[PDB]
Amino acid sequence: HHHHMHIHKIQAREILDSRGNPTIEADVTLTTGIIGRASVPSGASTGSREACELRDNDPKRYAGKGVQKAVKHVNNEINQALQGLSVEDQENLDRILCQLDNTENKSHLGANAILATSLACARARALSLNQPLYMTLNQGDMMTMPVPMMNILNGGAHADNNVDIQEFMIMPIGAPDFPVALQMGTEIFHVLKSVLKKQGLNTAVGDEGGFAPNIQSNRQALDLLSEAIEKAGFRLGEDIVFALDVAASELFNEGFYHMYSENQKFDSHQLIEYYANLISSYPIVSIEDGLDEKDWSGWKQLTTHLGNKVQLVGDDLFVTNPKILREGIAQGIANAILIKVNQIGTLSETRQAIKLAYDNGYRCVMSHRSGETEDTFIADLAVASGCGQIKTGSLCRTDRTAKYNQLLRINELASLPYAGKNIL
Amino acid sequence: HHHMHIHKIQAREILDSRGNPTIEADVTLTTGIIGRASVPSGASTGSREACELRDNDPKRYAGKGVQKAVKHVNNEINQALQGLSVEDQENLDRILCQLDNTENKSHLGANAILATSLACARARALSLNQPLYMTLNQGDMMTMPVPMMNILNGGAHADNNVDIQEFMIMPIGAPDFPVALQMGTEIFHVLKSVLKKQGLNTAVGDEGGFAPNIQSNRQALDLLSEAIEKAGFRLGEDIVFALDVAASELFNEGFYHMYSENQKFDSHQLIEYYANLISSYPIVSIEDGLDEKDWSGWKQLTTHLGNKVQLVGDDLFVTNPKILREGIAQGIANAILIKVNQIGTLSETRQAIKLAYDNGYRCVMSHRSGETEDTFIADLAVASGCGQIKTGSLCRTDRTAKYNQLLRINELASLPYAGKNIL
Numbered sequence A: 001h002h003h004h005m006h007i008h009k010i011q012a013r014e015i016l017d018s019r020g021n022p023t024i025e026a027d028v029t030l031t032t033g034i035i036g037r038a039s040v041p042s043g044a045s046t047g048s049r050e051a052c053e054l055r056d057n058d059p060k061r062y063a064g065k066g067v068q069k070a071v072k073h074v075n076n077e078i079n080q081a082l083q084g085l086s087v088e089d090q091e092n093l094d095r096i097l098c099q100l101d102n103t104e105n106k107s108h109l110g111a112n113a114i115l116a117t118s119l120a121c122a123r124a125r126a127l128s129l130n131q132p133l134y135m136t137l138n139q140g141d142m143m144t145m146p147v148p149m150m151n152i153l154n155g156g157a158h159a160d161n162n163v164d165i166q167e168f169m170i171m172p173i174g175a176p177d178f179p180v181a182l183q184m185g186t187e188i189f190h191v192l193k194s195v196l197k198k199q200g201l202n203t204a205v206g207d208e209g210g211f212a213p214n215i216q217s218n219r220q221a222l223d224l225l226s227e228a229i230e231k232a233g234f235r236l237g238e239d240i241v242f243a244l245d246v247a248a249s250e251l252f253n254e255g256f257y258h259m260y261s262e263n264q265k266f267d268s269h270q271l272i273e274y275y276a277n278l279i280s281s282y283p284i285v286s287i288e289d290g291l292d293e294k295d296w297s298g299w300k301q302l303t304t305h306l307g308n309k310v311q312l313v314g315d316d317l318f319v320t321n322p323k324i325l326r327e328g329i330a331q332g333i334a335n336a337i338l339i340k341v342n343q344i345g346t347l348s349e350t351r352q353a354i355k356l357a358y359d360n361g362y363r364c365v366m367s368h369r370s371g372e373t374e375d376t377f378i379a380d381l382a383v384a385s386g387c388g389q390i391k392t393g394s395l396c397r398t399d400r401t402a403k404y405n406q407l408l409r410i411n412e413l414a415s416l417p418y419a420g421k422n423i424l
Numbered sequence B: 001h002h003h004m005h006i007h008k009i010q011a012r013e014i015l016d017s018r019g020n021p022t023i024e025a026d027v028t029l030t031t032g033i034i035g036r037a038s039v040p041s042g043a044s045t046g047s048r049e050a051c052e053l054r055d056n057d058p059k060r061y062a063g064k065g066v067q068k069a070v071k072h073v074n075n076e077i078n079q080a081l082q083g084l085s086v087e088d089q090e091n092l093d094r095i096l097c098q099l100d101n102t103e104n105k106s107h108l109g110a111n112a113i114l115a116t117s118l119a120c121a122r123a124r125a126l127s128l129n130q131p132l133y134m135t136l137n138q139g140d141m142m143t144m145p146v147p148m149m150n151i152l153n154g155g156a157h158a159d160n161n162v163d164i165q166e167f168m169i170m171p172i173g174a175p176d177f178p179v180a181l182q183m184g185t186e187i188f189h190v191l192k193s194v195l196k197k198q199g200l201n202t203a204v205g206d207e208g209g210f211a212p213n214i215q216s217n218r219q220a221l222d223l224l225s226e227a228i229e230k231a232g233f234r235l236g237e238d239i240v241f242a243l244d245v246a247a248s249e250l251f252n253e254g255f256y257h258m259y260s261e262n263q264k265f266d267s268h269q270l271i272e273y274y275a276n277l278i279s280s281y282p283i284v285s286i287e288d289g290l291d292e293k294d295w296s297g298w299k300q301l302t303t304h305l306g307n308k309v310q311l312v313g314d315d316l317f318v319t320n321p322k323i324l325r326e327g328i329a330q331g332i333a334n335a336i337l338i339k340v341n342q343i344g345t346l347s348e349t350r351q352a353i354k355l356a357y358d359n360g361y362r363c364v365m366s367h368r369s370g371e372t373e374d375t376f377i378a379d380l381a382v383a384s385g386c387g388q389i390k391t392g393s394l395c396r397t398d399r400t401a402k403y404n405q406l407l408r409i410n411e412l413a414s415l416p417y418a419g420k421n422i423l
């Protein structure tokens, strides 16, 4: 009977994210007793057009970062708005949530309250169907185990070192399947720890589990990773390639991009040239947010000049937002989008952005935030969407490894190809 | 009772919070219910811990694969347990121990055995349609535990110069557990500002505590004190300290080496050193203050300071009822750190707890420095009524997942918070 998908109750609670800041978790209980549960991540380098992350701003509670207001919105308005409705229709529930909030940026109820509800409903649906989450999430795309881009040296907003570039990532693109890809990246990660330790560089980790040394230059960071790849026995280019998240909106000030670690200040043109030179020296296949979220003329130039040679990922540029991605597609900027559910607030709108990217030749990279939880939703969504690439952290900290472990579990019975080099 | 019978047991290799392989098991009942559990891994491991079976293939995960343990679950353990009931935890655990037939579980591996033991416990809870902590209680009065929160990491958990492994705060003055978690978190974030303002490292070690270099252990305690005060809490009334020295890591050739302070100590001298710390700071608990083999030292420590401070045996006892029994008889320590993977079954862990309770020893439910997303120790801490948990700093989901599970239990458990009763 299909009334078994009807919602009995929705509730939320405050939990801690992986940085120690509160975030929201929602439980959706159906009339059969089944409970779908999901929690919401939180970024540090957040684009200016991300949907509203509703916080309490009480200085006497968690330094103003409580989320009891968002919890209260789930317990009250959202619960009573959705009770008796079916979780079988994800689009209908997300539509009701957006209309209940009735603001462009989800600032009445909070994008975190809406997303917690949206994802918990998706899990309640999957439990009702008695199928793994990734199966219930697929909308016809050919599923693959994704290639991970693994952020093993952290900088920028994620660490207190002098590193300007936010993320230095390795991608085990030459691996034959996902378990071996994880093994390769893990082995490189541990060799990198030894390489750093021998040079007296910091091996404590930043927010995403990558080491947080001070570096002499971005090139030194890439040299250190190259050294670790070689000492682990893998081949640059053939086995492992590089991806970067510059998070350049964090470096843009007063009309210039500031590479403080290198005492350099670049206009847009000079930073494009800077990237072209890095690409000619290292196998960098992907650059995320190479330019500022408002530098649309720069992004167009970057895409024309280097887009044939490298993947260019809009993160803050697009904020997982179909309206913004549509404008970017029309203007010809970037060729990939970083998919962050909590940048937009619902599964359904995330799916819109994915469809708009696929239909127009853009790749999708499924992504964590730097503030994670134990929730592994993005592992199932990466597989289900067939996007072929995931960005979910270094190889330490369970906020990251829990996603890698969920991919290992999915790989057991999914009988799916590894995206591998097809992502190029 | 047909609904509690085992259909199949299987295992898989996953990554722990340090990036090293570990084992996770699924126990599938004839009803289709699946109990799942994974196994943590220590860094400063006692010499008498049960065998953590690794593959030792240098071409694979630097020799730290656990496929041998996974295969022991898939084959020997599955075949031995097919058709038995998870209703009786002691029976399954007895069967697992007899199947291995070695003193330190070196044939199947304590990790293979523990993964099965805990997965069976979960499948049992699910079959009873009861929260895990409910199904784990064995008559003790349940409480929400006071957390000791390791917010400055050293020793084997970070590559800084810090000798003491763990500097912990305990929000003993909090009215309930959510407020205790809030207190510790607020201090954690303030401590980050304190360190950052002094130019000290705020990247984190294995358990989520900051990993700066320090001038001395007193300086570290001063830095924690400054953060407690700037966060607006009171030393003593609100917040007290606990330490894990992991002194077996510091012991070599008759002396304990505090390299960071350019000093070494014999056992007698290190006892004095603790006495002086305790008189300068509100330290209420010292774990592994002496080497795992320094039994004469531990006796002296216990007689001299045991009425003033909690003395937690960790490597001293390795959650092993046989060793705890010897220690109680000799009068050493007054608490035990409970680590399921030091002994290898839930049933033997429960034996240690009961043996401690029956003799006036306190129990501290504990993580390992290498954790997984598994939150079993949150439910076990509550179910045991031990009143104290050690499960990490206030960042890294390997730690916060356990605090989050305690928040979830607290919602409907209607249980008191152990508070100052832990003294």
Ligand SMILES: [Mg+2]
Residues within 6 Å of the ligand: A043, A044, A045, A046, A047, A247, A315
């Ligand atoms: Mg960002």
Ligand SMILES: [Mg+2]
Residues within 6 Å of the ligand: A245, A247, A288, A289, A315, A316
């Ligand atoms: Mg980014």
Ligand SMILES: [Mg+2]
Residues within 6 Å of the ligand: B042, B043, B044, B045, B046, B246, B314
């Ligand atoms: Mg230890």
Ligand SMILES: [Mg+2]
Residues within 6 Å of the ligand: B244, B246, B287, B288, B314, B315
């Ligand atoms: Mg210890």
